[PDB]
């Protein structure tokens, strides 16, 4: 029973950051040596755990979170970070125990495109590992908006341009966040 890591990383298309996909992984043997020792990753930052010793540990559950963001915003996927994405789209807890993996995807997700979205307006910051997919019109004034965009009424979602002619910071970056769970329940995700 091989853990479906390839489904997450090698997916044909990714989800937008505001509706980031999460893959629950359980009851399988995990071979991370296929994942690391493979290069092609521009950023592989691990917190609290070592990917080197990941092949001989047992975890209750493993989560793989997939989304596409700009290169400038990759730094926001880190504990204690702040920004549009860290506050309104995807938040990591300060005690995050996992790895953040990103790589440039200008070849795949950039069209001379306009399909990846991010949340631009929100009244409060996101709690860690919280998913918000609301498309309700953001009310910036005392006047109710009645679901129609206008003055003091903005659509909370904005779309990345993702043009191949943009700079490296503007280029799309597929990001996969690995979160490891160690509940008291019998461990189901181990390695060789």
């Amino acid at each position: 029973n091989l853990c479906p890591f390839g489904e997450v990383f090698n997916a044909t298309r990714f989800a937008s950051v505001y509706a980031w996909n999460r893959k629950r992984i359980s009851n399988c043997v995990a071979d991370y040596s296929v994942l690391y020792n493979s290069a092609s990753f521009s950023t592989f930052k691990c917190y609290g755990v070592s990917p080197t010793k990941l092949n001989d540990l047992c975890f209750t559950n493993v989560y793989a979170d997939s989304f596409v963001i700009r290169g400038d915003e990759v730094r926001q996927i880190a504990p204690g970070q702040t920004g549009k994405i860290a506050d309104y789209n995807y938040k990591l807890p300060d005690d995050f125990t996992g790895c953040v993996i990103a790589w440039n995807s200008n070849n795949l997700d950039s069209k001379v495109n306009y399909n990846y979205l991010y949340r631009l307006f929100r009244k409060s910051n996101l709690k860690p590992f919280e998913r918000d997919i609301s498309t309700e019109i953001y009310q910036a004034g005392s006047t109710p908006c009645n679901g129609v965009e206008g003055f003091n009424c903005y659509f909370p979602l904005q779309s990345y341009g993702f043009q191949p002619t943009n700079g490296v910071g503007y280029q799309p970056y597929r990001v996969v966040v690995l979160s490891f769970e160690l509940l008291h329940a019998p461990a189901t995700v181990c390695g060789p």
Partner: antibody
Amino acid sequence: EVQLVQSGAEVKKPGESLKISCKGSGYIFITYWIGWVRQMPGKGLEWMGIIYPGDSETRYSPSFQGQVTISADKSISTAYLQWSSLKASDTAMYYCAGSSGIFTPMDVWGQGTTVTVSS
Amino acid sequence: DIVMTQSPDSLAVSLGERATINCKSSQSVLYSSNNKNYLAWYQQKPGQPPKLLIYWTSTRESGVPDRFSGSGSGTDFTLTISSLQAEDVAVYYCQQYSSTPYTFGQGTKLEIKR
């Protein structure tokens, strides 16, 4: 089997500027954070700071904040520890330690660099 | 800064006997709800760089002989060498990696009691 190779021994007069290097080799290296440890003659190990080569995120120990600069160059997979002005108090052996994450033990160690600052 | 204190400063253990080194933590060395103490043991032979022996207070680095054992919880930790050999003479340090200020122990000198 990742390895860290540091620069050669350095002998400098007080007030000079020094830049020592630490190059690592290994397939699993994008995950490896590079830190610096100072060991004064006859004394224990003192942790100076750490840097992630990918985004050059540097976290310094308060005892070494501003006293030294930690840099990186992901193109050549090397990390650097530079003093603006050397003082005789800096006579020590400096190791660079590699760890596959922040808040993880340092598995890979360099051979060490001996810095003797004297007039 | 989480101050790490070791005891004894120097230890003399005869060949083939058991060597015990203690490490006292000023604070907790827990990073999250893993309940795993983020504490490690390092061995430094004279003229040698430090070598990681035990991490997470219980797991040994690949290639470390079984005679090395680590235990403890909370603020008290202990490194145990079950059968001391001639190649175990070194200085042993305990280091925590819970908070960003990484702190090493004072160092324990281990010598063979002849």
